[PDB]
Design a protein around this ligand. Structure first.
Ligand SMILES: Nc1ncnc2c1ncn2[C@@H]1O[C@H](COP(=O)(O)OP(=O)(O)OP(=O)(O)O)[C@@H](O)[C@H]1O
Ligand SMILES: [Mg+2]
Length: 342
DNA sequence: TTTTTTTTTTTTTTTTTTTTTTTTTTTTTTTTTTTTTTTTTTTTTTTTT
């Protein structure tokens, strides 16, 4: 409601925001402004920034196609203690219209909708669940893996078609569920073991993994230098970019910027999809489907929107590719087996 | 012994019927009683030779 309000920014504010957008590293600054208390998960924070910006809403209505999902769905898969729940908590406490779900505490009808009897009118009324209450926001699903397939099938239609068709006893409709999904999950065996391939170790239905457009592998390097740096950050946390500018920057980008693909961006996307499909066709890697091309499109549009660009260019597609590869650690992945360490 | 579908099964109600309980409610005649008449049976002041 605020972002749609025409006089939300003074001219001074708009000029300051545009001056920020001209900075070479506005992307990194805005990403680093997120979850400032979390130590160097720069790629996860960039992905979450892109999720907060989101892709370009499109009207495919005259194409027979249906509704295209402009939302970015991120999955954080990693061994415990790596601060996934802290990131989900930060996004939960930062966005309007968000929901937090964890594990077995949610059901399928508790995420979609159900009938209760309003105890002020003595009338049965329909109540929405977590996935509809975040219809234009982010639903944070924690312990994604410790969550039974009954309720995780509900996510398929939400993540593909942004709608929630319910055909119950009397009530038939299509609730809107245009949510972004930020999911955090543990590997099978709750700890990444290096003897198993990525697919064997994430252990999610392979159709469901294609719905996420970033899978960040939050793996622990047995690295002593990182141990020391993280230890200093955490201990320093026991004794001692603005937000308002970030807030207004994102609001301005949502209001005014509608990135459109340029011809050379189009070509970059074609090449990127073909290459990524060659790469992911290996043994136990997360494969690429035509849905990952749209993942790239969404990420590129979001990145162009970070620049206040209004035009998607090769740099946006390049950053989409890079983010997609860094998540999943595809540089550390051989085309035969799992990964090792960075 | 990790994952997974029938099975209830306790909890929300809703229906829903059958049964017991609840809620509502002045007018109209009649009759005794008192206070009057009214015909009749006395009875108490009138007068005569
Ligand atoms: N890189 C990091 N930056 C900041 N804090 C961290 C980092 N890694 C770990 N921590 C701290 O360690 C704790 C990790 O717990 P958290 O719930 O965030 O992890 P998690 O990934 O959800 O674990 P699990 O997979 O078991 O759910 C948090 O208190 C967090 O503050
Ligand atoms: Mg957690």
């Amino acid at each position: 409601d605020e972002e749609a309000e025409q006089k939300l920014f003074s001219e001074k504010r708009v000029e300051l925001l545009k001056e920020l957008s001209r900075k070479p590293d506005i992307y990194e600054r805005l990403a680093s402004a997120l979850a400032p208390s979390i130590y160097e998960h720069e790629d996860i924070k960039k992905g979450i920034l892109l999720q907060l910006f989101g892709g370009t809403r499109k009207d495919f209505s005259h194409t027979g196609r249906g509704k295209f999902r402009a939302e970015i769905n991120i999955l954080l898969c990693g061994d415990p203690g790596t601060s996934k729940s802290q990131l989900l908590q930060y996004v939960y406490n930062l966005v309007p219209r968000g929901q937090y779900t964890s594990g077995k505490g949610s059901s399928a009808v508790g995420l979609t909708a159900y009938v209760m009897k309003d105890p002020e009118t003595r009338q049965l009324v329909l109540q929405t669940g977590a996935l509809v209450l975040s219809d234009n926001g982010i639903c944070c699903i924690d312990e994604f893996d410790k969550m039974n397939e009954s309720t995780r099938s509900v996510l398929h239609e939400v993540m593909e078609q942004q709608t929630l068709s319910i055909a119950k006893a009397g009530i038939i409709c299509q609730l809107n569920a245009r949510t972004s999904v930020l999911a955090a999950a543990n590997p099978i065996e709750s700890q990444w073991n290096p003897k198993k391939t990525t697919i064997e170790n994430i252990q999610l239905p392979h159709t469901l993994l294609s719905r996420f457009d970033l899978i960040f592998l939050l793996l622990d390097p047995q690295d002593e230098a990182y141990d020391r740096r993280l230890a200093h950050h955490l201990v320093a946390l026991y004794y001692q970019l603005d937000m308002a500018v970030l807030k207004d920057y994102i609001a301005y980008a949502h209001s005014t910027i509608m990135p459109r693909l340029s011809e050379e961006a189009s070509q970059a996307l074609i090449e990127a999809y073909v290459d990524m499909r060659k790469i992911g066709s290996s043994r136990g890697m997360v494969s690429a489907y035509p849905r990952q091309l749209e993942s790239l499109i969404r990420l590129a549009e979001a990145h162009a929107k970070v620049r206040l660009s209004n035009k998607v260019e090769a740099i946006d597609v390049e950053e989409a590719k890079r983010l997609h590869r860094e998540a999943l650690k595809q540089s550390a992945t051989d085309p035969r087996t799992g990964i090792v360490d960075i």
